[PDB]
Structure 1
Amino acid sequence: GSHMNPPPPETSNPNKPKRQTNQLQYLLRVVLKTLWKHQFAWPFQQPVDAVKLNLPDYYKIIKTPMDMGTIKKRLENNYYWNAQECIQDFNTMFTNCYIYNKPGDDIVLMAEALEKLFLQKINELPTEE
């Protein structure tokens, strides 16, 4: 894409140790699955394209970007060591939205719907076995 967008977050790095856990499996099969198909998922399914959206200040404000397209790749391509890393990525994505946008903007209401679902699912994150 544009040189004016940053490179996306890291999704493949052989030097980073990887592991499957039952909790990571749940994050892919239950959490990402649920949120990805939500009616309000589409703004969150790829990195913010600040050029196409005419938001030239986006990456001036948001220095820790994250999105569900990146999280999907990290889950599918076994990037994580533990569930906390992936939960933190979801939380970063929501917080970016809430920091950049005005409360009550459509995108914020969309993020909040996804976050409510997220919280319900993470409350049932299975005990690590």
Structure 2
Amino acid sequence: DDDFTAMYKVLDVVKAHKDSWPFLEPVDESYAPNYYQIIKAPMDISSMEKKLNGGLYCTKEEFVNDMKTMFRNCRKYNGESSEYTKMSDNLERCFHRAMMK
């Protein structure tokens, strides 16, 4: 199957994972004060899904880079001990495995 379908299947696997729910929509400062002063390259799953449907992932590498940015932002903002960082780590390992199939 083609790259678009391949990438979309990976999104579906990531979205279906139990720990995906914090990452589904753009970060809201209601629960994350000063987020956009701290994180200058924000990313979330809905935004990736919009890019994918809009034809903006010209290569799989660009999709990977956005996914990895979303995880890096979570760790940077929430810190190493956050429950959310643990979720990010779990989701990132799931993502790596999905990406290789």
* Aligned counterpart, 2:18: 39
What CA deviation, in whole Å up to 9, does each residue of 1:61-101 have, x standing for no partner?
10000011101111123222111111110011000011111
In the aligned structure 1, how far is the partner of 2:4 from the partner of 2:74? 24
User: Which runs of 5 or more residues in structure 2 are unaligned?
Assistant: none
What CA deviation, in whole Å up to 9, does each residue of 1:11-57 have, x standing for no partner?
xxxxxxxxxx823321112x10101011111110001011x21x332
* Aligned counterpart, 1:27: 7
| TM-score normalised by the chain length of structure 1 | 0.72
1:36-115 correspondence to structure 2 within 5 Å: 36-50=15-29, 52-53=30-31, 55-115=32-92
Q: How many residues align?
A: 101
In the aligned structure 2, how far is the partner of 1:79 from the partner of 1:86? 9
Structure with bigger gyration radius: 1
User: Which runs of 5 or more residues in structure 1 are unaligned?
Assistant: 1-20, 125-129
Distance apart, 1:121 and its partner CA? 1.7
In the aligned structure 2, how far is the partner of 1:114 from the partner of 1:108? 10
Query: Which residue type is aligned with residue 27 of structure 1?
Result: M
Percent identity over paired residues: 34
Query: Which residue type is aligned with residue 85 of structure 1?
Result: E
Q: Which has the higher helix share?
A: 2
Deviating runs (4+, > 3 A) in structure 1?
Answer: none
Distance apart, 1:104 and its partner CA? 2.6
> For the aligned residues, what is the CA RMSD?
1.5
Query: Which residue type is aligned with residue 32 of structure 1?
Result: L
Higher relative contact order (Cα pairs below 8 Å, separated by 6+ residues): 1
